[PDB]
Design a protein around this motif. Structure first.
Motif, PDB file in Angstrom:
ATOM      1  N   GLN A   1      40.482 -57.808  16.813  1.00 44.15           N
ATOM      2  CA  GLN A   1      41.642 -57.828  15.908  1.00 44.15           C
ATOM      3  C   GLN A   1      42.661 -58.888  16.326  1.00 44.15           C
ATOM      4  OE1 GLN A   1      42.866 -53.773  14.111  1.00 44.15           O
ATOM      5  NE2 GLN A   1      42.205 -53.209  16.182  1.00 44.15           N
ATOM      6  N   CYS A   2      42.808 -59.055  17.638  1.00 44.76           N
ATOM      7  CA  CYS A   2      43.761 -59.999  18.226  1.00 44.76           C
ATOM      8  C   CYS A   2      43.097 -61.338  18.587  1.00 44.76           C
ATOM      9  CB  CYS A   2      44.380 -59.349  19.475  1.00 44.76           C
ATOM     10  SG  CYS A   2      45.543 -60.401  20.404  1.00 44.76           S
TER      11      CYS A   2
ATOM     12  N   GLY B   1      41.968 -64.397  14.612  1.00 42.71           N
ATOM     13  CA  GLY B   1      42.988 -65.286  14.074  1.00 42.71           C
ATOM     14  C   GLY B   1      44.286 -65.220  14.860  1.00 42.71           C
ATOM     15  N   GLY B   2      45.009 -64.107  14.700  1.00 46.16           N
ATOM     16  CA  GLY B   2      46.277 -63.908  15.395  1.00 46.16           C
ATOM     17  C   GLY B   2      46.931 -62.579  15.056  1.00 46.16           C
ATOM     18  N   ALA B   3      46.482 -61.500  15.718  1.00 49.68           N
ATOM     19  CA  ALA B   3      47.022 -60.151  15.483  1.00 49.68           C
ATOM     20  C   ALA B   3      47.122 -59.346  16.794  1.00 49.68           C
ATOM     21  CB  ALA B   3      46.157 -59.415  14.456  1.00 49.68           C
TER      22      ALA B   3
ATOM     23  N   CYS C   1      46.628 -55.003  18.517  1.00 49.74           N
ATOM     24  CA  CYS C   1      46.038 -53.665  18.300  1.00 49.74           C
ATOM     25  C   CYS C   1      47.083 -52.548  18.087  1.00 49.74           C
ATOM     26  CB  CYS C   1      45.080 -53.303  19.440  1.00 49.74           C
ATOM     27  SG  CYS C   1      43.482 -54.158  19.341  1.00 49.74           S
ATOM     28  N   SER C   2      47.211 -51.631  19.071  1.00 48.84           N
ATOM     29  CA  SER C   2      48.126 -50.485  18.983  1.00 48.84           C
ATOM     30  C   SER C   2      49.595 -50.891  19.163  1.00 48.84           C
ATOM     31  CB  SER C   2      47.712 -49.407  20.011  1.00 48.84           C
ATOM     32  OG  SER C   2      48.464 -48.216  19.842  1.00 48.84           O
ATOM     33  N   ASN C   3      49.932 -51.341  20.368  1.00 47.53           N
ATOM     34  CA  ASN C   3      51.297 -51.764  20.710  1.00 47.53           C
ATOM     35  C   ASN C   3      51.259 -53.012  21.590  1.00 47.53           C
ATOM     36  OD1 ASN C   3      51.596 -48.538  20.296  1.00 47.53           O
ATOM     37  ND2 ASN C   3      53.554 -49.546  19.856  1.00 47.53           N
ATOM     38  N   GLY C   4      52.368 -53.285  22.305  1.00 49.23           N
ATOM     39  CA  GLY C   4      52.439 -54.439  23.190  1.00 49.23           C
ATOM     40  C   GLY C   4      51.647 -54.219  24.471  1.00 49.23           C
ATOM     41  N   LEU C   5      50.332 -54.061  24.297  1.00 51.37           N
ATOM     42  CA  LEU C   5      49.394 -53.809  25.393  1.00 51.37           C
ATOM     43  C   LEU C   5      48.860 -55.126  25.985  1.00 51.37           C
ATOM     44  CD1 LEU C   5      47.111 -54.164  23.002  1.00 51.37           C
ATOM     45  CD2 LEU C   5      47.208 -51.675  22.935  1.00 51.37           C
ATOM     46  N   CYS C   6      47.591 -55.445  25.699  1.00 50.54           N
ATOM     47  CA  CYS C   6      46.944 -56.663  26.189  1.00 50.54           C
ATOM     48  C   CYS C   6      45.997 -57.226  25.128  1.00 50.54           C
ATOM     49  CB  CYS C   6      46.165 -56.372  27.485  1.00 50.54           C
ATOM     50  SG  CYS C   6      44.764 -55.230  27.264  1.00 50.54           S
TER      51      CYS C   6
ATOM     52  N   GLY D   1      39.932 -62.392  22.029  1.00 49.68           N
ATOM     53  CA  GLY D   1      40.850 -61.790  21.096  1.00 49.68           C
ATOM     54  C   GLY D   1      40.571 -60.320  20.896  1.00 49.68           C
ATOM     55  N   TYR D   2      40.427 -59.597  22.007  1.00 48.27           N
ATOM     56  CA  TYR D   2      40.176 -58.160  21.950  1.00 48.27           C
ATOM     57  C   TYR D   2      41.292 -57.399  22.645  1.00 48.27           C
ATOM     58  CZ  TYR D   2      36.784 -54.651  20.425  1.00 48.27           C
ATOM     59  OH  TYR D   2      36.131 -53.657  19.735  1.00 48.27           O
TER      60      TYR D   2
END
Length: 40
Positions: free
Chosen positions: A2-3, A8-10, A12-17, A22-23
């Motif tokens: 997703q990230c 592309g540029g997204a 997941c849940s919160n400001g994690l890692c 891009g996982y």
């Protein structure tokens, strides 16, 4: 995925890692033990 550029540029849940490709995660092999680029 997703990230990062793997999608592309997204995020997941919160400001994690976000993995090298891009996982993003907070508990699987993305945030703990796997391919953690930002945080582990």
């Amino acid at each position: 995925f997703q990230c990062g550029r793997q999608a592309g540029g997204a995020r997941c849940s919160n400001g994690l890692c976000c993995s090298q490709f891009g996982y993003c995660g907070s508990t699987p092999p993305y945030c703990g033990a796997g391919q953690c680029q930002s945080q582990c």
